Point group: C2
Chain length 330, copies 2
């Protein structure tokens, strides 16, 4: 069996639909008359051209069959987060998007699973949408590491993760591209540099703030893309904790001891990096993800994990075993 817990979709909306939310700030799908090709737009302009497999659940069950992929977990493309929008507006938007997600999943609920998006800017609306969308069939939630243009240390954020831990709602955290602001303007430097750094920051912020000593152990939380640069830079973080007062201030154990409080996906695009990742997190805490169906997504889903020299026991937890437990999937 083979579960891919990192993949994305974008609903078949309309330019007019989106306008009633926002005509030049709300995304929408523009499939051309030629329907095996399209684009995501905002108003007049083109945000992003995209493969058909982003929509069309049957078209996807096709690709999932070519690859050895049985169960896919899919979630919102980051464009639709609306974390910068008005709280009740975004709540309405998240509802619609989450409804679209189930539609997309409805094509085949046994092999296509969905996570929901939430209005993360407002605690109460977020908890509410989290609970609602899960009751309606979502296996969990995907949230951003950012929040529009956000400093990611709020105590409402602990409140939120605690709500999810209590309701047995698993969480996937997925990065944004913003940190160096007006540097990194070329060559997708935001994806190559800013994002892995933002993800490391989201993790360390939970660790070094002592959040894990307050969030119940029942919390199931996973960080996309191998947790960014976290695994590689862990040694430096542990060194700092050991030799500097201010690093220990709110975090009573060594930072590397908290790896048992979270998961990461396997999307690190390199054998050596995967080995190191597994060594750091353990074979129980890494889940296969592909970022499907994007160009950057791994071409042979699971190819990396399979091609490695990890134990056969290890390869199985990563390709199926862990995601089964995490998302409660058969």
């Amino acid at each position: 069996p083979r579960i891919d817990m990192h993949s994305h979709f974008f609903p078949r909306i309309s330019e007019q639909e989106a306008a009633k939310f926002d005509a030049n700030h709300a995304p929408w799908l523009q499939v051309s008359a030629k329907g095996d090709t399209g684009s995501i737009m905002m108003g007049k302009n083109n945000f992003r051209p995209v493969y058909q497999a982003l929509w069309d659940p049957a078209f996807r069950i096709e690709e999932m069959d070519a690859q050895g992929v049985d169960v896919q977990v899919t979630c919102a493309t980051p464009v639709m987060f609306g974390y910068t929008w008005e709280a009740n507006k975004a709540a309405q938007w998240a509802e619609r998007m989450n409804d679209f997600a189930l539609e997309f999943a409805a094509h085949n609920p046994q092999r296509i699973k969905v996570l929901a998006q939430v209005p993360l800017q407002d605690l109460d609306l977020a908890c509410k949408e989290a609970s609602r969308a899960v009751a309606a069939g979502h296996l969990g939630i995907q949230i951003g590491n950012h929040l529009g243009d956000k400093d990611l240390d709020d105590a409402t954020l602990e409140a939120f993760l605690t709500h999810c831990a209590n309701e047995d709602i698993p969480i996937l955290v997925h990065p944004w591209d913003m940190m160096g602001g007006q540097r990194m303007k070329k060559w997708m430097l935001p994806w190559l540099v800013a994002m892995p750094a933002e993800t490391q920051l989201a993790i360390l912020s939970l660790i070094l703030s002592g959040a894990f000593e307050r969030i119940p152990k029942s919390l199931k939380i996973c960080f996309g893309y191998g947790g960014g640069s976290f695994a590689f830079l862990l040694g430096r973080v542990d060194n700092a904790w050991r030799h500097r007062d201010i690093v220990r201030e709110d975090c009573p154990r060594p930072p590397s001891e908290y790896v048992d409080r979270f998961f990461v996906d396997s999307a690190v695009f390199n054998p050596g990096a995967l080995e190191l990742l597994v060594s750091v997190m353990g074979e129980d805490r890494v889940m296969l993800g592909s970022d499907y169906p994007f160009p950057l997504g791994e071409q042979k889903i699971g190819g990396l994990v399979l091609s490695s020299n990890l134990g056969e026991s290890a390869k199985d937890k990563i390709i199926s075993g862990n995601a089964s437990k995490f998302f409660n999937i058969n």
Copy 2:
């Protein structure tokens, strides 16, 4: 078979009143206590950082080197001394002053203490002149910061400076400083833990992805601090993006991973699995032992991580001594 540490810092005996003449708020100076074993780097009347004697006392430092089995240490300015935001002429006088201090520091024992120079990088012409002057006077190379405000290493001015050093056979160490982030990562030393390895990665990728290595002569000897930051680990993600996205291929003719033959990194990565990955990405010829001595987060036992890693003995030899002897021309 000299054991060489190539990443270390010094700070000169500068008085508050001397530093005031350059900048009453932003020029760093050194305040030493009464017993004289400890002190602080200061900035205006503000305390900047606690330090100890090894930073400013070459005699004391030699004793510590003796106790660590370090035969030769290459040392350079503490990055707070860079002054990249100052008015160019003033920064050029500062650099020459600091560079003379460095040589006086090394003059205690120039067989075991080597120095790299700083340059007024905000003015290309003055930077090039200072680089050449300092190396002529006995510096083995230059240490620079990894960016100048919003100018990364791919900026025409920085590529121009690098080309000058390549043509003059002046080795370069690139050190992170003035980390990105803003108001986002103040506490728990996050700028050191997050922004700095990303800054270093960004510096390396800026050279690679802009095609600057196609334009800079192969004779350039350039080393990046702290193992290249998170560069080695994220290099799969970069090669993938290059393979499947055109705007990434734009100015970079070969796959990014192939440009590892154009630079070096130090070994300060605080973890043996990390160091092993580094060496497999870079090659055993392109990693040099550096410790960040004498700062608190510096390696407590110098070379200790390298000796305790799974690397072959020949790789260990190169990392500990051979690579730096060749890079800095130490003999």
